[PDB]
Amino acid sequence: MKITAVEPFILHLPLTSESISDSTHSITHWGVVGAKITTSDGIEGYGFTGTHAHLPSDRLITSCISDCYAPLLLGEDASDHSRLWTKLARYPSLQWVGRAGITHLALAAVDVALWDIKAKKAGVPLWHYLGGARTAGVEAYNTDIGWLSFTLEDLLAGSARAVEEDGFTRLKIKVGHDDPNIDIARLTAVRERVDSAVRIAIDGNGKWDLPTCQRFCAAAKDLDIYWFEEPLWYDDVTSHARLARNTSIPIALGEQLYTVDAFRSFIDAGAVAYVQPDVTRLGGITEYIQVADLALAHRLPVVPHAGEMSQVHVHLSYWHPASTILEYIPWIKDHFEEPIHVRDGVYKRPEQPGASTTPLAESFTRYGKAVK
Amino acid sequence: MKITAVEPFILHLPLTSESISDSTHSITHWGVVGAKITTSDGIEGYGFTGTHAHLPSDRLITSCISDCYAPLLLGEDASDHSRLWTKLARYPSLQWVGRAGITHLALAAVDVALWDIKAKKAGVPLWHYLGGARTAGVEAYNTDIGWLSFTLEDLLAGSARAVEEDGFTRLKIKVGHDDPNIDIARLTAVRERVDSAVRIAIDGNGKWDLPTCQRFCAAAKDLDIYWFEEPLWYDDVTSHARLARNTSIPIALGEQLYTVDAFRSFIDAGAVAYVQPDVTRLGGITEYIQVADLALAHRLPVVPHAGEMSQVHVHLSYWHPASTILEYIPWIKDHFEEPIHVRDGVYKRPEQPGASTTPLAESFTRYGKAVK
Amino acid sequence: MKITAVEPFILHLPLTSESISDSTHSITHWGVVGAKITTSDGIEGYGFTGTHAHLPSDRLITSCISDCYAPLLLGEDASDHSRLWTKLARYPSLQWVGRAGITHLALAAVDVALWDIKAKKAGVPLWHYLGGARTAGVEAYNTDIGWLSFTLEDLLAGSARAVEEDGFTRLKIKVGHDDPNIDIARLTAVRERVDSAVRIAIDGNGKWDLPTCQRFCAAAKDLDIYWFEEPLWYDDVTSHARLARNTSIPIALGEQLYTVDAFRSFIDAGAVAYVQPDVTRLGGITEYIQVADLALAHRLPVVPHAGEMSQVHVHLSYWHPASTILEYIPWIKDHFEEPIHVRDGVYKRPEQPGASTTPLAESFTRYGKAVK
Amino acid sequence: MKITAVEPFILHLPLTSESISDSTHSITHWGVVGAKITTSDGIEGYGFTGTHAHLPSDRLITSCISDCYAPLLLGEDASDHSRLWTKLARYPSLQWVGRAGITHLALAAVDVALWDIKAKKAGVPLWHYLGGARTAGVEAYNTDIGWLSFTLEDLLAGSARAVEEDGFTRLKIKVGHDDPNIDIARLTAVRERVDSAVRIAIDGNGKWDLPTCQRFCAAAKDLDIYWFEEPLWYDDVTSHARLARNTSIPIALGEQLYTVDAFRSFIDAGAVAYVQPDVTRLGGITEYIQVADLALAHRLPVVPHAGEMSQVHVHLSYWHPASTILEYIPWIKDHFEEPIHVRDGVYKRPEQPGASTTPLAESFTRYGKAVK
Amino acid sequence: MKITAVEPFILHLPLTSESISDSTHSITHWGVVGAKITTSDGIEGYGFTGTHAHLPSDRLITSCISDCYAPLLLGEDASDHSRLWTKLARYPSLQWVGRAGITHLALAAVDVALWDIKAKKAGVPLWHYLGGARTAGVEAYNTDIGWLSFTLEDLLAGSARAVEEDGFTRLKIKVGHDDPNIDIARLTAVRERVDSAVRIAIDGNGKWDLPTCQRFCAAAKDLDIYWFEEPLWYDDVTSHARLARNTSIPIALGEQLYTVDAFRSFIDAGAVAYVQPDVTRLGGITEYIQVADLALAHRLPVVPHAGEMSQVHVHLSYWHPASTILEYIPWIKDHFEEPIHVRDGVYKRPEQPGASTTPLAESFTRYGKAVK
Ligand SMILES: O=C(NO)[C@H](O)[C@H](O)[C@H](O)CO
Ligand SMILES: O=C(NO)[C@H](O)[C@H](O)[C@H](O)CO
Ligand SMILES: O=C(NO)[C@H](O)[C@H](O)[C@H](O)CO
Ligand SMILES: O=C(NO)[C@H](O)[C@H](O)[C@H](O)CO
Ligand SMILES: O=C(NO)[C@H](O)[C@H](O)[C@H](O)CO
Ligand SMILES: [Ca+2]
Ligand SMILES: [Ca+2]
C-alpha cells in the first residue's frame, strides 16, 4: 500500500544502572532513533537504529530520514521493500556521502519499518512471516551482568545471580583493561564462582592490538572462553585473520560492520567464526538476511548483536537456520508493545503482528527527544 | 494453512526440434517432474524439477515425493516453508541417502510448490511477493538457436533469425566437439554473420579437460565470448580455478551444483564469475535465494540456468538485485497458465498470483506420464 | 561371461541393542540394499549399499537398479567391470539426475556385485585376486561400544569389556552433545577406566561448527584422541581445513563423500588425515581403489568406514598398501556365508571365493523386504 | 592559538556544462561543504569536503560540524591538529555512528581548516610548510573533457582542444556504458583523433562487475590505457585483486575510501596500483599523509582524486615524494583567493600562505546556501 | 633560512657499568656521531646517529657528512627538509654506494638536525610542532637492568630495584646464551623475584636460528613474555614470519632496518608485531614518520629503539598516534640541554624548543673525539 507519512523519532531510554562502561564507551541512556512509516490503510511500521544517545548525532540520523529519504518514500508502495532499499541506498547523491555511517543507519531504520508493515499487514509476527521456526527454543546469553565498569565484587554477584537465580547458562563478560592480566584475574574469579557448565564469552569492543590479543588468548587457555568478540580494531581484517590462526579461542565480530562487503571480507579471510550482523548497523533486515545467508554458506553460526536489544533479532534468530544463541540486555524491552521475554534462559516466540519494534505511547511521551 | 494432499506428476513435453544435442546429451523431450500440493483452503501449488524425460528415473523423483516426503508434509502448515525445508532435507534417514541427487531434486519440487502456494495465498506474483522489481526489464538470451547438433548452416540461420527477426541481442552457443578447433570455426562464422553488437556466450556442458580448455580459450581471444559455461567436469573446483586465472574469458557454472556448499567452494576459489543457481537443481527457491545472496556478497552476477525453462527464474531475476540476464528456451512455456514471454529481447514481467508453475489442465492430459 | 539376470534386494537386519544413536541419527535396523547379478555360467554376485533401513528410500535404490541399470547390464560381459562402471555412471540421462545420492548408491551395489563375480570366477577371495596381502593381520577397532545413546555407565562397561575380555586395544567413541564438555567428561572417564595403551578415536558425525570444534579440540588436548571423525558439515571443506590447522588432533572423514572429486577436494586442502572411503557410498570397489590410490600418493592412511560392516573392506584392507586399521561393528556379520571375524583385536583373513557379500538364503527369508 | 569560532558553510558552484554525467551520477553543481575556523589572533582557516550539491545531505555535514564537533574544538589550541583529529574522530558516541560517511566528511573539513591555519600562521603555502617541493612542476591531466554524457563528437572535440590548444598531454575519459564495447569504440576514436603521445586514463566509477571488466580490459589491449579507475564496486577488494592479476592495465582507486584501513586492505591485496587518496574523503590532510606514506612504502604512485578540485592536493602533490600527476577539473578554481592554474599541462606552484582553501568573500554571498 | 655551516662531531659517552654486553656486542662507550648545522639567523640544529664508539668507523660517518653531504646542504634553505632528504639520499653517485649503511646513518644525522632547526625556529618542542600530544604520559620500559653480561644475582638485584625503588612496571631483559635454557632459567628467576604485574620483554639481538627460537618460545610459554625482540638474523624475513606463526609470543624488530622498504617487507609478511623504527638507523625523522604511518595503517604498535637513548623518540612517541611505550637507557641523558627524565615509569614531556638533541657545550670538550 502507499506510503502516506514518514515521521522520525528519538527515544533516550535509561539503563539498568546510572552509567555502564565497556573498554571504549561510558553511557547513561540508550538511543532508539528511527522512523514511523504510515501507509494508506492506516498501518504504522516502526524501525530504528541503536545509538549511545548523543542528541546532536541522533538528529543527523533523523534529519537524513526526514529530509533525504522521506521524499523518496512518500507515495511509493511499501510492499516493495527490496526495490525501495536500492532506491534509497544507491540514490546517487546520497551514496556519494554514504555506503556507511549516518546514511546507512538511517536506511536501517527505514528498512526495518517497511518489514514491520509487511508482517503487520500479513497479521503475523515476522519470524512466522519469513517461513517458521528453526528451533524449539532460542537460548539467551546475558551481557548485562558483565560490564567493565563493574567492580570484581559486583561482576561476581551479578554473574552468580544470573546463573543461580535467573536460570541463565550463558554469559558474556567485557574485557579491555589496559593490562589484560586484570581481565584474566576477573575471568578467573568468575570461573571459580560459577558452575563449570556455564558458558562464558568475552568482548573487547576493539580495544587491543594484535600482539596484546595473542598474549591474552594464550593466557586465557584454561578459562574455557566461548568466543572473544571484537578483539581488534573494527576495520582491520588482517589482524583478526592472524589472531584467529594463532589461538583456539573463536573470534566473534560484526556489530560495527555496515555492509555485506565488509562481512564478506572478514568471512573470506577466516577472520571471524561467530558472525554478528545487526539490523541497526547493516541496512536493516534486508541486508541482515544477505549476511545471514553468507554465514550459512560458510556454515558459520549467526549470533546477532543487540543494537536493537533483540527486539528484531528474536524474530530473525527464531527463523534463520544459521542462527544459534541470542544476546540479552533488558534495558529497553518494557518500553515496547511486545517486550522480548526470557525465562529459564530461553526467549519466548513473538506473538503479535510485526517485528516487535512498536514502542508504547507512554514511552514516547516520557522519553522522546526533539528532532530539531 | 494445512497441507491436505501431495500428488506427484510427470510431463514429457516435446522440443523445437525432434532431437537436440549438446556436448554430452541428446534428448527428444523435456521432463517436468514435480508435485502438486493442496492446502485446506483449496489453494493448489505446483513445483517441479527438470529432467531429460527418462521415465524410469523420473519415477524415482516422484516416488521420493509420494513415499518419502508426503508423509512428512501432510497436516503441516504450508506457510512454514523454511522449517519444512529443514524437516525434509535433513530427515536423518533421507539425508543418509541424500544431500544431492534424487532426494534433492524431489525436495526442489516440494519447496517450489510451497512458494507457489505462499504467493497465491498472498494474491501476487512471486517477484512482487519477495519485495518488488530490481529492473523495468530482464533481458533475455537465446539458447535454443545454439545446439551442438545443428549443422553450421542451421546454426547460422537460427542465430541470424534470432537477431534479425526476433530482436535478440544475446545468444548462447554450444561447444564441445572433440577437437575444439571445430568450435572456433563455428563461432567464427557466427561472428562474421551477425552484428558485432550481439553478445555471444558459449557452453561446453563439462566435456573438456583443463589443457584443452586453456588452448581453446587462447584460440577464442578475438571472438568476444561473453562467458564460457561449464568448461570442465562439474565437481572439479580446482581445474576451474586454474582456467579462470589463465584466461580473460569469464567462467559460468552452477546448473549441476546441488548445494550451497558447492557454490561456496567454487565462488571462494575464484572458479566462477557468472553464478548459475537453478531452483530445480538446488533445493528450490529457498536454497536458490541463499546462493543468490552469496553471489551478491561477492558482487558476482546471478544468471540462473533454465532447468524450469525460466518459468520460476523470471520471478527471481525480476526481484533479486544481483540478477542480470535470463536464459530463454521456448520449449514448454505454452503449457503453462502464465507462459514466459519474450519480446524484443526482454521478458515480460509476470502478472498472475504464484510462481508461474501452474501447467494447463489440458497439458496434463495430453503429456502426462503415469508415476507408477 | 554374459549377465543374464539382475535382481535387487533389501534386508533389514537388527542391531546389538534395540536402538542406537550417534549425534545425528537413531536407528533400529541396518539396511542391506543391493543386487544379485547372475551370469550365464551360473555364478551369482552380490553387492550392496548400507542404509538406515527406511523402506521407502531403500526402494528408490532398488528401483534404480532394476529399472535404470538392469537394462544396461543384461547381455553384457560381466568381466568388463571398468567399462560397465562408466556405462552406468555416465549414462547421460541418469548422470543428469545423479553423480551423487541414490543413483550413485545403486551404482555402488552393482559394481561390488561385478567384483564379487570376478573373484568367484577366479576361485579366490578378493584380497588375493587383487594381488595378495599387505599385512599378516588387519587390526580392528570397536565402534559398537561407543554410541552416543549409551549412558556413561554403559559406555564405560562396554569399553572395559571390549578391552579386558575381548582383546581390543582400539576403540571409537561417539561425540556430539549440544555442550561438548559432556563429551569431554565421558571421554575423560573412559580414559580413567581403561588401560593407557588403548587407542581411542572419536566421531561427531557432522554435528558441530568450526568454533565449537576448535574449543573442544583444545579441551581434549590431554585425552590422547587418535582421530576426530566428521567433526564438521560433510560438504564444508574449508571449515575442515581450518580446524586441521588449529589442532594437533588428526581429522578423519569420508563416509559421506560420494565421489573421487570430493575426496580430492578435502585431501588437497589438508582437510583430512585419515581417509575413509566406503564402497557403499563411492561408486563401489572401482571408485574406492581410486581414492585409496589418491590417499597413497599423499602418504595418508586408508581406514574405510563400515557402511557394509566391513564385509567387503576386510578384503580391501588386507590388500591395499595404504590401508591401516579397520572398523568393527558386528551387527550383520552372522547373516553372511563368510562373516567377518575378529579375534584378539585382529580380523581374520577371508578364505572363500568372492568379496564376502553373499548373504545366507535364510536371512532373505526372515529379513527380506519386498522391493515393490 | 585558541579556537574562538567554528562556522560551517555550503557553496553550490556551477560547472563547465549545465549538466555532466559519469557512469553513475548526473550533476548540475559542485558542493563545497565545510567549516571556517577562527582563532584568537584573527586567523581564519577554511576546509571543506566535496559533494554533489544535494542540499539536504550537505546540511547533515554542516550540522555535524556545528553541533557535534564545534563543542569539541572551541577553546582548544588550533596548533594541536593531530591531537584534535583523534579527539573528534574517536569521540566515543560519534565513533559509534561514524568511522565513515557523514561524520568522516565533516572531520575532513575541520582537519583541512586546522592545516590552513597552521600554514597561514607560519606565513607560507602548505607545500612549503610541509618541507619543500619534490618537483619543479606537477603535471596535470584533464578530466573535464571526458564525461560519459558527451556525445562522441563532443568527446573528440574537447579532447582535441585540450591537447592541441591547451597543451595537455594527459587526459581521463569516463567509461561505463551498459555495453563496454561502446566505450571501446569511443576510446578507439579518441586514440585516432589525438596524437599517440597523449596519455589516456579511464574511469568507470564503480559501474561494472568482474567478468565485464575482464572482457573490457582484454578488448582494450591496444588502446594504451594509462589506468582504469574504479572499475568495480567500491568496497569489493577481492574483485579488484582478481582483475589486477588478469590484465596488464593498471588499476586506480581511492576516491570513495574513507579510511587508512580501507586503503591498506586494497594495497596489501595487490588490488590497486595508482593510489588515489582525497582529503575530502579520508579524514583530511592528516589521514591523507598516512595513506600517501603507506603508498610510498609500497613504492606506488599517489595521484589524489579532485574532491576539492585540487585546491588542496596541488600542495600535497608538490610536496609528497610519492606523488606523480594531478587531476584537473576547472569548475571552482575562480572562486578562490588562490585559484589553481594550469599552463601547458603543468600546475603553478601555490604562493599564498595557507592551503589555498580560502574562497573569495563574494563567493559566500553569491553561491552560499543556508545551513538550516 | 640558508644553511651556512655543517660541522660534524663525535662524542664517546661512558655507560652505567664499565662494560655491558648483549648476545652479540660488548661496549664501554656510546657513540653520538652527528652534525651541527647552522643557519644564517644563527640557529644551530643538532642530529646524530648512535654507534658502539668505534672511532675509525665513527669517522666514516663524519667524513660522509662533511665531504659528501655538506656541499649539497650549504646555501640551501634549511626549511626544505623533505626536498633536501631526497637531494642527499638519492644523489646518484652516493645512492650507488648507499641505500643503507654509512651513507644512510649520515643522512639520519643531517635530517634530525634539520628537524631540530625547524622546531627551534618555531619556538616549540618537536612533539608540539608536529601537532600535539597523543597521550598525557609516555610509559617507559627499563632496558638498562637486563644486560646479558649481568650475573643472575645482579640481573635480579637491578630488576628488583627498578621496580621496587624506581617505580618501573615494564622491563626488558637480554637473552642469547648458546643454550637458551640458561635464559629460560634467568627469566624464570626474574619472574619469581618481581611482582606479577611487571611486564617483561626480551631481546636476542639476532643471535639464534629458527629452530632454536621455536623451542625457546615453547619453553617460555608460562613466563608471560611481552615481546621477543630481534629473535633471528636481521635481514631474514622468512624465518621471522615462520616463527611468528609458530608461537603466541609477539615478535619485535626494527632497530637494524635502514629503510622503509625493509620495514614494509617484514610488516607485510606478518614477521613483526612491535615495530621499532629508529631515527638513527632509518633516514632520520623523515623516514621514521613514514614507517610509523605504515605501522599505523596495519594497526601495529610503534615502540622505537633507543639508538639516540630516546632524546628524539620521546617527542615522536608523545606525538605519533601509533606509539605506545618507550625504551629507557640512562647512559647519555645528562649530557643534553634537555635530558630525558623518567619518574614513576613515565617520561616527562619535553619543554624546550627543538628535538632535545642539543648537547651541553661542555659535552664536546669533555667527551668529543677528533673527526680526523
Ligand atoms: O559490544 C556490545 N555488545 O556486544 C555493546 O554494544 C556495547 O558494549 C555497548 O553499546 C556500550 O558501548
Ligand atoms: O546446459 C544447458 N543450458 O545452459 C542445458 O541444460 C543442456 O544443454 C540441456 O539440458 C540438454 O542437455
Ligand atoms: O559414523 C559412523 N561410523 O563411523 C556410523 O556410520 C553412523 O554412526 C551410523 O550409520 C548411525 O548413523
Ligand atoms: O570519478 C571522478 N573523478 O575521478 C569524479 O569524482 C566523478 O566522476 C564526479 O564526482 C561526478 O560523479
Ligand atoms: O638491542 C638493543 N636495544 O633494544 C641495544 O641497541 C643493544 O643491545 C646495544 O646497542 C648494545 O649492542
Ligand atoms: Ca565467501
Ligand atoms: Ca593431490
Ligand SMILES: [Ca+2]
Ligand atoms: Ca602493507
Ligand SMILES: [Cl-]
Ligand atoms: Cl557517519
Ligand SMILES: [Cl-]
Ligand atoms: Cl542467533
Ligand SMILES: [Cl-]
Ligand atoms: Cl552458538
Ligand SMILES: [Cl-]
Ligand atoms: Cl531490552
Ligand SMILES: [Cl-]
Ligand atoms: Cl521535535
Ligand SMILES: [Cl-]
Ligand atoms: Cl541421485
Ligand SMILES: [Cl-]
Ligand atoms: Cl550479465
Ligand SMILES: [Cl-]
Ligand atoms: Cl519454455
Ligand SMILES: [Cl-]
Ligand atoms: Cl539422492
Ligand SMILES: [Cl-]
Ligand atoms: Cl591407523
Ligand SMILES: [Cl-]
Ligand atoms: Cl557386522
Ligand SMILES: [Cl-]
Ligand atoms: Cl553517511
Ligand SMILES: [Cl-]
Ligand atoms: Cl603517474
Ligand SMILES: [Cl-]
Ligand atoms: Cl576547479
Ligand SMILES: [Cl-]
Ligand atoms: Cl656501511
